[PDB]
């Protein structure tokens, strides 16, 4: 609390400070002042609330009407008595104000070979020209690390950036794995944040798989395709299954009970559960993981492994056909589940 540097800026309205000594402080709100590198003053009381957020960290949530700027600086204010080290020393104003610097936003693996990452700040992000085709440019922005910390040898191929969104596409050789993490490398000169740059974060972001497609496995069951190897509780109970996949009628009314049992699929990245849509049983059914899901995990059922994030919106259970049977020497008849429609001419070329 006399001279320190670091911090993690996670969103457009929240900061956190990293310090040397552990603390049990309850309040920090009125213990900081805001300037910039240009020396134009900012929020006198930048923060509305504080709580302990780590071994030594103090979270500092910005109040309304405040947005980040390059080289933002935060310094301890006068006569602050709530924040203290466990040694009994309250913070005093520092000779050099700490610099607020960013850290990447959330991440999710929408497709088995695409990684999408949001960013803490939605403007100013720029990179050296050639990032769209140079692995020396895109690949130097973020490091991909196993659970043990073994960085991967350029599993990426390209980077795509626009406003607050960023995207890194894997490769066939660089096949994805469960339980991996992504974090920035120290001093990387590629990714900027306006008139600033991005610096490695405290813990990184653990990648989570998700859902991609759904269909009818049998006449009364449904297959579910996943972007990573799946795992479910052994011989799970019906209640467990009903607490994961929220299932809604065509217009959006919920279905309290849809599944009787849930278990793995033909492949390690597939699942099969009871009931079906086929536009029977609802005529429009859709599936989606619940917001606060608990039990659908990848790699294993361990607590550390990532969860399956819910998709962007509910997936539509994709229908199939029932059977075909020869009747005459010039005709086959095919049963289709419940009514259907035709969108065009049924000429020989069309069929």
Residue numbers in the entry: 29 to 379
Authors' description from the paper:
Bloodgood and Sloboda have shown that the flagellar membrane glycoprotein 1B (FMG1B), an unusually large ≈4546 amino‐acid long molecule, constitutes a major part of the glycocalyx of C. reinhardtii, which localizes to the ciliary coat and is visible as a densely stained layer in electron microscopy sections. The results find FMG1 to form a protective layer with adhesion‐regulative instead of adhesion‐conferring properties and an example of an undescribed class of mucins. In wild‐type cells, the ciliary membrane that surrounds the central axonemal structure is coated with a diffuse inner layer of low electron density and an outer, electron‐dense layer consisting entirely of FMG1.
The resulting ≈3 Å structure of FMG1B revealed the molecule as a long, twisted chain of 34 individual globular subdomains of 109.6 ± 10.9 amino acids and one cysteine‐rich coiled domain. The individual subdomains fold into an Ig‐like fold with each two orthogonal beta‐sheets and one short alpha helix, which we call beta chunk repeats (BCR). We modeled the semi‐rigid structures composed of the chained BCRs to high confidence, while the flexible nature of the cysteine‐rich domain resulted in a lower local resolution density which, together with the absence of bulky, recognizable amino acids, could not be assigned confidently. The C‐terminus of FMG1B consists of an ≈100 amino‐acid long intrinsically disordered region (IDR) linker followed by a multi‐helix transmembrane domain (TMD). Due to the inherent flexibility of the linker region, no densities could be resolved for either the linker region or the TMD. Interestingly, we observe protruding densities by cryoEM that cannot be explained by the primary peptide sequence. Strikingly, we find a near‐perfect correlation between the identified candidate sites and the unexplained electron densities. As such, we were able to directly confirm 25 glycosylation sites of FMG1B, which were mostly located to the 16 n‐terminal and the 9 c‐terminal BCRs, all of which were in proximity to each other on one side of the FMG1B molecule.
